[PDB]
Design a binder for this molecule. Structure first.
Ligand SMILES: C#Cc1ccc(NC(=O)OC[C@]23CN(S(=O)(=O)c4ccc(C(C)(C)C(=O)O)cc4C)C[C@H]2C[C@H]2C[C@@H]3C2(C)C)cc1
Length: 382
């Protein structure tokens, strides 16, 4: 207990962390279909665009029967059901996105959704782990994980660019997986004092984070800024600090009082903090207020991924190891990882500017947090 990353064997981290060697934090080969028993749920989730557009969604949810979650017997089926019910819930609350909101989630969604969220230790609102990490398939199983060979499972509105936004995000996560699988090698090389093994491990991580950033560049080709800001972002909005639901949402039949849960945040992806921790970068941007927000978003990650991040912080310090040596190869390799991270943060800042800050105009605290985490990262260059 408390001795850093648990291992399944001499090569691979513990399966308890639910990190896949091929897709990383993403869920491997997600389930696309629920048991027959939940067909009515699947129908609504598959037809969300035309049900919202026609004004039919809320009545159709209001006519659902209460389905027990007992027939969701494995992790993949529970994650698919969370995605389905999360999408239905966002669509039910926000409707067409023009301010006609519902403040009471009907019990025939609220209860199984809340029970399932309790099993998975995730809040009962859509999170990154649902709409990106489990929200995909290959078109052709025998072809590789590329944009052209992939699709999402659920969208909110036709033209909302959710395929572009979610798949490009997923593909960045998959690119980062090639870096994550090297982490045990880094710490093994430190224990063994294997200079070359550590060096090549850091070069491989740096190379995979460079590639992940080139995947991120694809967002511009599949997401229209106006459609993202004025349409998709509605359905990723939550009811924590939201003046449209100032007390939260009533989960009918689960809690008596309304409850607040936060909407999507880039802070729900584990990738940034994973490599900040590995490399010993300590983010300071935004003070205790940003730390509390970002820790709360950590509780919106799958619990096993939280435990991975927390075990990482207990391992020996890579940065301190490289700092204990007059070794230019190690310093340059460490620096390549940090530079790749700086570039990923710098690009993050540019995307927030083009896809949120600019549309909004057509705020200041967000642009300066992104600038500050970028300069904190840059100041970690050894
Ligand atoms: C529920 C849910 C929900 C929760 C989270 C997310 N997305 C997310 O966590 O993505 C991580 C990213 C960051 N972006 S992003 O384009 O900068 C980005 C991400 C998220 C937003 C949202 C819509 C939440 C917002 O604030 O309005 C806005 C923007 C501009 C993409 C992705 C790629 C790289 C940079 C990291 C990455 C390392 C993997 C989507 C839905």
């Amino acid at each position: 207990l408390g001795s850093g990353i648990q291992m399944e064997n001499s090569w691979t981290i513990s399966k308890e962390y639910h990190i896949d060697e091929e897709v990383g934090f993403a869920l491997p080969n997600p389930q696309e279909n629920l048991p027959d028993f939940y067909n009515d749920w699947m129908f609504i989730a598959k037809h969300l665009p035309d049900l919202i557009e026609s004004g039919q969604l809320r009545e159709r949810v209001e006519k659902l029967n209460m389905l027990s979650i007992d027939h969701l017997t494995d992790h993949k089926s529970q994650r698919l059901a969370r995605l389905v019910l999360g999408c239905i819930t966002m669509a039910y609350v926000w409707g067409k996105g023009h301010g006609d909101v519902r403040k009471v989630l009907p019990r025939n969604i609220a209860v199984p959704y809340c029970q399932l969220s309790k099993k998975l230790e995730l809040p009962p609102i859509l999170v990154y782990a649902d709409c990106v990490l489990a929200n995909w398939k290959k078109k052709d199983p025998n072809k590789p994980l590329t944009y052209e060979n992939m699709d999402v499972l659920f969208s909110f509105r036709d033209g909302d660019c959710s395929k572009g936004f979610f798949l490009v995000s997923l593909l960045v996560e998959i690119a980062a997986a090639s870096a994550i699988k090297v982490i045990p090698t880094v710490f093994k090389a430190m224990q063994m004092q294997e200079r070359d093994t550590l060096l090549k491990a850091l070069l491989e991580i740096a190379s995979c984070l460079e590639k992940a950033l080139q995947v991120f560049h694809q967002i511009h080709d599949h997401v229209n800024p106006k459609a993202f800001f004025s349409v998709l972002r509605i359905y990723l909005s939550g009811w924590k600090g939201n003046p449209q639901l100032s007390d939260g949402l009533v989960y009918e039949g689960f809690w008596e009082d309304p409850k607040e849960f936060a909407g999507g945040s880039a802070g729900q992806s584990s990738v940034f903090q994973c490599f900040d921790v590995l490399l010993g970068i300590q983010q300071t941007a935004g003070g205790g207020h940003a730390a509390q927000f970002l820790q709360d978003m950590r509780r919106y990650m799958p619990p096993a991924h939280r435990n991975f991040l927390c075990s990482l912080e207990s391992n020996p310090s890579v940065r301190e190891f490289v700092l204990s040596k007059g070794d230019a190869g190690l310093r340059e390799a460490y620096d390549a990882c940090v530079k790749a991270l700086v570039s990923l943060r710098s690009y993050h800042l540019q995307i927030v500017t083009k896809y949120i800050l600019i549309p909004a105009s057509q705020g200041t605290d967000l642009m300066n947090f992104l600038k500050t985490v970028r300069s904190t990262t840059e100041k970690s260059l050894l």
